Point group: D2
């Protein structure tokens, strides 16, 4: 007998530890919120300081930042990043993100208040854009 055969599994040991090292848990958690949940958003703007609370069935996310001051958040796929928001125009902010660890597409986001009373969030990865459009409750 050599390796040739039809093999059936009797034991699978410690896969959760391997998935944890690979960051799969962080990706799953993040996509559960971002891709698979309908969000509701609460913003408190005090000058150029922002509180943004994103509520979903599975997670409530709160970020706090001041325009022009570096802060930490997660990318849309859950990776920790340093973020810096700047005004692009009077009604549009742009956030550049840098990964704390590893490599990946260049990610960013924008938030704009439109003339039609809408809030527009864009999220970019290497020039591919996702758009979310919100109206006041």
């Amino acid at each position: 007998p050599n390796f040739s055969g039809n093999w059936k599994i009797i034991r699978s040991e410690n896969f959760e530890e391997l998935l944890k090292v690979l960051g799969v848990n962080v990706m799953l958690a993040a996509i559960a919120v971002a891709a698979a949940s309908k969000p509701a958003v609460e913003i408190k703007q005090e000058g150029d300081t922002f509180y943004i609370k994103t509520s979903t069935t599975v997670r409530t996310t709160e970020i706090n930042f001041k325009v022009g001051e570096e802060f930490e958040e997660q990318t849309v796929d859950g990776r920790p990043c340093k973020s810096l928001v700047k005004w692009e125009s009077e009604n549009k902010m742009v956030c550049e993100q840098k990964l704390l660890k590893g490599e990946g597409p260049k990610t960013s986001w924008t938030r704009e208040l439109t003339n039609d009373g809408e809030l527009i969030l864009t999220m970019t990865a290497d020039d591919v854009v996702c758009t979310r459009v919100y109206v006041r409750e």
Copy 2:
């Protein structure tokens, strides 16, 4: 007549997140992130038949509490709400039968045993299939 034949390229995809949320895909993904993809650490406080279990992972800390012999609500490993009832099988082993609050699925259960060697054994069952987790005290 209209001919759907072609090589089609996508220009827009709208509101998929709403569809996945009605389908419960968010709840399942979140639950699998914790159960399948995270190394857990477990804190138990037992006072007689009353249990507090805190399960810590990178992505979630879960706290449950129950009394042996009293129905309570928890979630299945895939995140479905269930009614649970724990009974002693023996002095050192508790068994939990689960019933879904909504819908149908595999029969699920769990057991927790404290061995004579001071190991904690969790089993989780779905129909014919059993998963085992073994823990030691820090």
Copy 3:
């Protein structure tokens, strides 16, 4: 009496993949990899009421076929096996009702429409909630 109290550290986790398979978690993850997380390209061949639809993504190429007015088996958008029946709503629009082969869930359906502007519109519904995808020819 046995005391389960402690700070427990995991040493072994055995056979979780079996449990996830019985729970259908694999089928959900595979389906969401394609539907939620991939940009699709779609090839259609229509021969009267018979359709061949090939969906190409980074992770999978899928082929389905059906005949309008004949019950067939496919998967829901979240991967659950279903019985499907497509009917013409108009010359330009087909509508598909789905029924799960096992278990319960939101009522799912899809429609495919060819517009006068040469667009293909896919809608997917679950209970009150609609996702729309729009395609043009290459």
Copy 4:
């Protein structure tokens, strides 16, 4: 002013973003590796191997010769170059190098035991998962 309670009306093209991010690759790979019970067919012809891993969601086929670089995927679906060597008469070891990007150092081993078992190990940065098989 951005202050308010905002309700979503449209979410557009998230699938395109997730595809750029490789989330599809990771989901597909874990559907097979973590969430499926595998069945494995091996054909060993000299030191040439065909390994077919069958699951509910995917059948995967690799072909390699011991000592010759080939391409496969890591456990989380990333394309890699692989090289298998004999560590011992009954145990092969495979080192992997990502084609693109950065990640944990990954490897796998396959062993035939004297008790008739097949043992697969898969490692990422010194964290090991083990699969044990017997002949059908």
